[PDB]
Amino acid sequence: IPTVIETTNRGERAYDIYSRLLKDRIIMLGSQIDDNVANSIVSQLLFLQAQDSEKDIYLYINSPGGSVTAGFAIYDTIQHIKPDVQTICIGMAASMGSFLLAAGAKGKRFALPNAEVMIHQPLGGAQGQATEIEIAANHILKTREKLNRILSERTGQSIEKIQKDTDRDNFLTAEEAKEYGLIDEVMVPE
Amino acid sequence: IPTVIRAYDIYSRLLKDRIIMLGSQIDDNVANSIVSQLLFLQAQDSEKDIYLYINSPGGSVTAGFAIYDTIQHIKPDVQTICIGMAASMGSFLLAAGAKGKRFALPNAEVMIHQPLGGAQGQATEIEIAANHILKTREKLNRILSERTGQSIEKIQKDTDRDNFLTAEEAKEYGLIDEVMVPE
Amino acid sequence: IPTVIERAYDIYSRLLKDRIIMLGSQIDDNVANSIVSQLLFLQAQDSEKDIYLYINSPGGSVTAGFAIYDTIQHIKPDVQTICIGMAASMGSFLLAAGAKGKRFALPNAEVMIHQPLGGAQGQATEIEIAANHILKTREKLNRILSERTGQSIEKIQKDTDRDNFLTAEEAKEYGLIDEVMVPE
Amino acid sequence: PTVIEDIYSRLLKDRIIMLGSQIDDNVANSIVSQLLFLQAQDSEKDIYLYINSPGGSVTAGFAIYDTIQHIKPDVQTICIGMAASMGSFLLAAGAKGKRFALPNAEVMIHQPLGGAQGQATEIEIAANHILKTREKLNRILSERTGQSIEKIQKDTDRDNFLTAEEAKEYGLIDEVMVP
Amino acid sequence: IPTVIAYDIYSRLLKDRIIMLGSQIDDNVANSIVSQLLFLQAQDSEKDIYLYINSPGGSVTAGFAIYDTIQHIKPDVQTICIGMAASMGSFLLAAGAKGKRFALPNAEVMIHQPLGGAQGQATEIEIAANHILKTREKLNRILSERTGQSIEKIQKDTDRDNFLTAEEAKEYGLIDEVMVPE
Amino acid sequence: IPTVIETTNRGERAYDIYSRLLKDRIIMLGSQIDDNVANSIVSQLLFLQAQDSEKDIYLYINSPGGSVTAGFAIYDTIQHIKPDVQTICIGMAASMGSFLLAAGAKGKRFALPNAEVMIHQPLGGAQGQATEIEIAANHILKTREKLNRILSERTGQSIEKIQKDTDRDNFLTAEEAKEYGLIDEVMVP
Amino acid sequence: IPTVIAYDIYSRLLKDRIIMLGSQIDDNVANSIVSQLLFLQAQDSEKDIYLYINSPGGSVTAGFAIYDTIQHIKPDVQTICIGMAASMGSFLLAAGAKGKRFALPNAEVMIHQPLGGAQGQATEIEIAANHILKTREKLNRILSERTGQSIEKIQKDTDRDNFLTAEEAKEYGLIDEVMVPE
Amino acid sequence: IPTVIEAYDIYSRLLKDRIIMLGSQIDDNVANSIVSQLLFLQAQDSEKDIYLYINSPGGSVTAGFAIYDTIQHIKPDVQTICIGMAASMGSFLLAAGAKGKRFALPNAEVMIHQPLGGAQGQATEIEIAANHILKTREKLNRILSERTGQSIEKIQKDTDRDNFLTAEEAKEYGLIDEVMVPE
Amino acid sequence: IPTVIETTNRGERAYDIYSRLLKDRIIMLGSQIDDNVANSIVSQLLFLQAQDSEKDIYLYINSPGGSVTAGFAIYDTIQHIKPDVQTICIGMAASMGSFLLAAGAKGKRFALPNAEVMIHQPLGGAQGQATEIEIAANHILKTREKLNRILSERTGQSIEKIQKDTDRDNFLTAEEAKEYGLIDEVMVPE
Amino acid sequence: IPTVIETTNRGERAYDIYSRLLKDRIIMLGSQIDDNVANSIVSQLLFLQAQDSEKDIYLYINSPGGSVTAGFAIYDTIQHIKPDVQTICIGMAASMGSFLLAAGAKGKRFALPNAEVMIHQPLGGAQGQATEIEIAANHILKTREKLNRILSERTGQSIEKIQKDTDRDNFLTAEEAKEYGLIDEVMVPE
Amino acid sequence: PTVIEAYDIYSRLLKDRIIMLGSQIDDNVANSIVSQLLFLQAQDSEKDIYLYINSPGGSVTAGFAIYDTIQHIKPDVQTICIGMAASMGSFLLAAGAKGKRFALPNAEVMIHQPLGGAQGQATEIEIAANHILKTREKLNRILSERTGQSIEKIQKDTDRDNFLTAEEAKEYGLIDEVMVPE
């Protein structure tokens, strides 16, 4: 992980590349979603909301998704904080990554032209007694209905369509995700 | 595994007396063996009673239903005797013996509980697995209610956690008809 | 496995002398090789007596199942099929493959139908080749099952998407069996 | 070794049964089958059970106990090396006056071994079952030995190693075989 | 494996001059098939042998041992495809007597180039590559003789796993007839 | 990794060798391409655009390639930023490594005389239900069409030629990669 | 492994003085083959023995055990390469009786120097190298006797793995003729 | 292992001819089997010779002395024939044969070495284990000295490292009496 | 790896021993050659060429060799830069290390009196369909021809002689490496 | 490994205990010898010659030996260097460690009273074809001849005597090592 | 943990001249100990050094390293047993300056003969045995001189594991007094 040196007209200082990007208000979501990752993202979004409650935040998303509860943590923090978070799919947004994509400010969800979006129903596991498997199934089905309903709200597709389309793994190009409504536009190559 | 001289093993010699031994987990290969023996003993004499000895930790539910269905389909009555342990699929086979002819030895144990399973993968697949194991539990509770005479609600309540019955409690529950007193 | 007699059989060989075939295991090429050898031996013994196939399997290899299917269709004697416990995957296909009017289930056996399972690795064109092969395999299965059951290919296509469990009476209403063996 | 007219099948003709291994459901199934066979052969001649066992499953040992009490022929028990708690339990289960040890045989009595994992309710159910199993074993030992149930409760708390003379004084065996 | 009386099922079928190839072709399998073929030639040199094939193939030199045996012996070896014939299984399917190579209607055939590994010093990788290429040339030349297809067509068509139905295998000339049910 | 201590009008700083090269605007890709490497390389490219939109960036490639999505992340970051990225093959550019080599600016893609370029179709796999295997095959076939189309744009070869030339592991010398159009020029000392 | 009645297939072949060598050569395989050779000499001192070879070879001292047994006994041993004869397998192939070394047309032969290893002290690696070199000398000398090739030529040709067709093995003098199918 | 019916295995039919095949490493289970075969062949006839065909890397020294002491205890002469290799105790059992009746085949090889061992734990235990392996090497060197006619010092020096001997060198050493020339 | 600090002038500069040697334009190549090592060596060469385009680099070689593409990366970098690179074999130069040893500037290849040089043909693996084994063999054979051409130019032996000598492992002393032309002289101690 | 803080008119400065001993020109050869350890030792010897070329270096040996080519990279003690390297055995000098002990300057090789020295022939191995085993055997034997020749010239024992005495593991007390000539004096307890 | 003054706790203890031997004795810790003892000798050649010992012992050559360095440096090294001193830990405990070996009141001291191992040839096992026996004689002799106890008594008592209290270690002479709490 490279270090960047920058002049400040009051001194000179060394940052990690991610910490300099964090000074620009850029958050890197570049790995699977787990507890440690969600804790980091939440702390970064809360620090940045504390520093400046008007300026946008830039969540960069390149992840295979991950834990649904940690994704809901990042979602709820993004909806709680005052400043708008702008989601940019850099190459890959799958599972909760494609949800954290669709979870950004309206008009401010972007993808690079060759980024991949995958939407699919959640994965889980159940073991032991029949009643324990019943409890786990009912919980994962409520989780899927919560995800589908948030997606229907943020995407404008009906819940029946999101149910049908997430049944198997649906791979979207950025143009397909723009026509779906998971993103607002595809970034024109400056 | 000793031999009786013709050169039977001890189980083949007890099969000559129409005795079948269950002494293992119930799986497809054990159920396939027991079903084969039951069809053989039906072909050897369709009248004389079969004697099924159970010391099993339970096992596969579809293999136990295989045995159950074969016991119900053959003409000869199957006397079931519990020797050491009868755990839920063993207890289900114990109940499946002929009425008036289900026995336990005085220190045998019975255990009744709901079926075990699992699921992985998509929410729809976990749904289908849960639905299947719930319908399997309903089918088990229904057959148990018919065999014991206990209500489905009572069996549902009693099977929720592992319920360990003595042979006298298994007679009171109606899982067996008699306790075999030593001669 | 208990012996039964100097004519010392094992229990399955004594059942084979009564023309009983026990399919109580996963279907691999080894069990398919044994089942096909039993079918050919029993055909050689007598071409007009019925065969009784007893099925309790999770299925297995599709090519081993088709080996068994092709053998029971090819040989002259009728094969009665009797589901004893589970008939999943190719086990349900071999259940449905029995002679008409001679496909049975015990009163609470269960039948499960699903699409075939496979995998692929390596280059994109190799994955394409494996996908084309497994889709042709699924089409072959759905076609044969549609002929054995009378159910349309579209319906079997819809119903085999996920694991579809059937009771014996649903399997009869699906036409996978002809009747349920009501106990004496 | 094979004897033409195996060594255990030849000894079974003499109504000799060898329990030279851990008690598990396979061993119990085999011993029960041999006991039912020897009952079907001759309902009145004695059966000799030679015991050299580290014990094993409690329910598999109760299978044997209940079979040797159920059948009509007397089962003599003869301890030649090891009788560990389930093996000493089956030793106690021999016919009265017909329980033997060889002079250097080792008898051990101890309480059941057990595990439970998972919910507090499930650990409670397993603890209750193991404590009721210990009560069943202690009661049956009290009847077979004649020792107080409180004495057996105290003595089985830790692993107790008895000599053959000590097992005779305890009442687990009736004689030590003089050579 | 059931007993017939004290044959096993395969030993009884061996009396009808049936051979079952129901497994991967390895040295032990080739050794057995070759011993069976030689025994059946000794029992009667004028009477057909029936070879039933359900195998994924395997070792090329074991398959060539079987091929050379069925070509050296006097009787006609009928080949019947039962489920799969892949790799040297489809080669041994093609090696049966002309007019006596069969598949059942739902069997399938796969033809492809052989599989190889070479860990090496560069001269040793070269030697292994030259050997595997001569092995492919041998296989393609014999397939061309057995099918009547050109060695260029067989080269082009074995380049990736080519799954053939029994109809496609009859069109290719790998079998002479599809055995309709009796 | 060694350190270099470098002086200015204000300072001593102790740089790692890669941080010193990054100060020059030099990015090293000396690794498999995975999401971590994609994120790092993208962040560096963004910081280099941040400091000066006009000056050329240099990307130095010694990679067996890797993930197609991570490589397309790098590719799209190269195509978004204003500054020209020079791509230099230092020893190996295989898989997405040669794709990222072809991603450099027209006239500013280089290889060293003994470098090698390899082009192939992407590797993947599939498991489970026939419908799942079909969906995976469809996805990786669309990914190969994407790669082939972008390579046709970078190199000027027809899609049918790139389709044939990537069917198996095709190894190019730097002079062959120059004739193929994957690079513009071979670096001479 | 089919039965024939109560023989197995290999024991029924052994009744006809057929020995099958369809595996790697280790001490158990050697001890089996040597016992069969001794029993065949015990039953009839004049009738030929037929040794079918399909082997990757293996242990060198096991191969020399087989070699010295087939050279010690009175009856001539016909060797038939089928499939593959590598390493000590092709050495035993050449050890057949003159005019009685055969291969099948698509069989193939490999000749190469012996493989070994050494560990520990310089003195121990020296001792092991000297022994593997004396073993290679012995193998080359015997091959020169049985093929009539020069020992310098065999030393050169065995340096790397050398795969020979049945015709090339005939020209090399490892076999006397190919058994062409009738 | 192939079968011959007059229903033997090939080794048991060779046992009819008094042929013992030592084709495997010498552990206690092999020594037990060979000593049993020797005692049986002594029972069947005490005057006819026994043939021991040796192809082994050797093994346990106590299993080697088990076989050696059985060969020397039984009355009938044991002809030893090296077929492939005789390393370690295999060369020792090769030398154990009857005088004038130790043979090798022309390309067989003999290896004579010092016995391997090990020690772990306390200095006193390592000392005891070393002293035992030294007395084992002494015993081996003495038996080789008397059976080969070489002196203790020569064998001690020559067995210090792995000494491979050709059959001609083993005849010069006195481990074999003749090389079996082909019939 | 010990730190060294005490210095003339401001004397602030604490180095690890390798950074202190890098101050003297000494590069160490004392490990297996891989892309990580090759990228490090290349970066150090580029840095030293930027700092001074005229002073010799000194490259100390104690490596069993390794990856051939990584070695060619190092080779092409030492050939591209303007400053001469002196190569010193301090203990071993096997395979690709002996190649980089021979790649030093003329008159500037050295070995210590007891260093050993081993030349051999490249090592390879190919798991394959027969066309894939053909492809891998053809590539490893082209790689050997490239290596032999370069060695022949750097060494003055004919490419047929290097073909003959590299077929097995050839272990050279420093005197034999001097006679061969892989090094220019053996460093006499003084 | 603990830190030392030292006080100077220039400031207060941290050292790990080994960097503080390196200030005093003390080199700890405290491990098995591998290429990385040899690299470290060679780099230290070079730095210490750079700072002062006529001031003794002290090499402290507690090593189970190691790689022979790494030990030969150390064997010189970079005998190129002008400074005299003293060698002290602290507890163990196993064959390459005792070789490096004997490499010290004459009159400046020491061993603490209760130190032990071991000499033996080099360990190795060979696998593969007969000619590859031959190549490896010829190499290991020539390496042993080289080690015996160096030990002969540095101890004054005949090559025949070192050949006989290194055949098996030979353990020498400090006094026996002085009689052999691997060291000049046993350190008296001060 | 850190102490801002910015030491870690062990570096601050070393500032006092306190060395902790609280770990397995391996070559790495022996090197650390030696280094530290020579630095403390440089810092002041008269002030005592304190070695605090809580170790199961370890390598005998690493212990003899620490020993011979301790008994060379000018200042008196004080040894304190904190909780355990076993094998070479008890040896380094006894190695402290006379009058200045201490134990805490319920620390334990264990003395036993060294462990070793031998493998391979009889003469290799003889050499490993002879070496471990000379190592034991060396240890016994040093302990005899540092405790005032006969070599026969140490030989007899170190045969098995001997566990000493601080009072028993004081009577043995391995320590000079037990530190009463202040």
Residue numbers in the entry:
A (entry chain Pd), I (entry chain Pb), J (entry chain Pa): 4 to 193
B (entry chain Pn): 4 to 8, 16 to 193
C (entry chain Pm): 4 to 8, 15 to 193
D (entry chain Po): 5 to 9, 19 to 192
E (entry chain Pl), G (entry chain Pi): 4 to 8, 17 to 193
F (entry chain Pc): 4 to 192
H (entry chain Ph): 4 to 9, 17 to 193
K (entry chain Pg): 5 to 9, 17 to 193
What does the paper say about this structure?
The ClpP double heptamer was resolved at 2.7 Å overall resolution. As expected, while the ClpP part has an overall D7 symmetry with a very rigid core which can be refined to 2.7 Å resolution, the ClpC ATPase body deviates from a C6 symmetry that cannot really be applied and reaches an overall resolution of 2.9 Å in C1. Five out of seven ClpP β-hairpin NTDs (Pa-Pd, Pf) are fully visible from residues 1 to 28 while the β-hairpin loop T11-R16 is not visible in the ClpP subunits Pe and Pg. The ClpP hairpins also form stabilizing contacts between each other via T6, R13, G14, E15, R16 and additionally S22, a residue that is not part of the β-hairpin.
Bacterial AAA+ proteases are composed of a AAA+ partner (e.g., ClpC) and an associated peptidase (e.g., ClpP). They represent ATP-fuelled and self-compartmentalized proteolytic machines that are crucial for stress resistance and virulence. ClpC requires cooperation with adaptor proteins such as MecA for activation and complex formation with ClpP. Here, we present the cryo-EM structure of the MecA/ClpC/ClpP complex from the major pathogen Staphylococcus aureus.
